[PDB]
Amino acid sequence: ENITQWNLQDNGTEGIQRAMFQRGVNRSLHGIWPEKICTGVPSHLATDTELKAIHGMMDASEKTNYTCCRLQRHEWNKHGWCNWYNIEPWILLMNKTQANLTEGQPLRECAVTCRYDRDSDLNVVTQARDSPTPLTGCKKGKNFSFAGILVQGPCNF
């Protein structure tokens, strides 16, 4: 029912993808997205201490040097409060999702966005999710690279 999406390292993509490559991070959670997007005022304002409890999730912002908490707070504000009601079960789910992502390539890993790399003739996956979706920036007929793992098609197992 929820889309789980994450960033993947890629030295060829400026921003979080490059920062992850430099730090030896392969997968960094972007979000867990139910159908409903939160509108209005959050029932609770996420603190830095709460957001830092999602261990290994890197912020997409250079303003924190890709650490915490701009993306983490944005996730709680836009997808968290209205769906989970309380920050505690959301922090635990996000943290466990990230822990699984840190362990290696997950159960279902489908490409979302690629950076086609001319040199290696590979579709370098910059963002993946746990369900198939139409692709963006992915060259037809090329193999896919999920944080160095070579796959035939857009979905990795």
Ligand X SMILES: *[C@@H]1O[C@H](CO)[C@@H](O[C@@H]2O[C@H](CO)[C@@H](O[C@@H]3O[C@H](CO[C@H]4O[C@H](CO)[C@@H](O[C@H]5O[C@H](CO)[C@@H](O)[C@H](O)[C@@H]5O)[C@H](O)[C@@H]4O)[C@@H](O)[C@H](O[C@@H]4O[C@H](CO)[C@@H](O)[C@H](O)[C@@H]4O)[C@@H]3O)[C@H](O)[C@H]2NC(C)=O)[C@H](O)[C@H]1NC(C)=O
Ligand Y SMILES: *[C@@H]1O[C@H](CO)[C@@H](O[C@@H]2O[C@H](CO)[C@@H](O)[C@H](O)[C@H]2NC(C)=O)[C@H](O)[C@H]1NC(C)=O
Ligand Z SMILES: *[C@@H]1O[C@H](CO)[C@@H](O)[C@H](O)[C@H]1NC(C)=O
Catalytic site residues?
74-75, 78-79
Does 97 bind ligand Y (CB under 6 A)? Our answer is yes
Compare residues 64 and 83 and give the one whose CB is closer to ligand X: 83
Does 88 bind ligand X (CB under 6 A)? Our answer is yes
How many residues sit close enough to ligand Y to count as binding (CB under 6 A)? 4
- Give the whole-angstrom CA distance, residue 114 versus residue 138: 5
**Distances in whole angstroms, Cα of residue 2 to Cα of each of 9, 44, 130:** 23, 21, 9
Does 99 bind ligand Z (CB under 6 A)? Our answer is yes
Does 2 bind ligand X (CB under 6 A)? Our answer is yes
Span interacting with ligand Z, options 35-43, 70-78, 91-99, 120-128, rule CB under 6 A: 91-99
Compare residues 33 and 146 and give the one whose CB is closer to ligand X: 33
- Out of ligand Y, ligand X, ligand Z, none, what residue 13 binds, judged by CB under 5 to 8 A for its kind, is none
Does 96 bind ligand Y (CB under 6 A)? Our answer is yes
Q: Which of 56, 62, 65, 85 binds ligand X (CB under 6 A)?
A: 85
**Per-residue tokens: 27:** 């997968």
- Find out whether 59 and 72 touch, Cβ atoms under 8 Å: yes
**Per-residue tokens: 34:** 């139910």
Q: Which of 1, 41, 63, 107 binds ligand X (CB under 6 A)?
A: 1
138 contacts: CB under 8 Å, gap ≥ 6: 111, 113, 114, 116, 123, 144, 154
- Find out whether 153 and 31 touch, Cβ atoms under 8 Å: no
Euclidean distance between the first and final Cα of the chain, in Å? 20
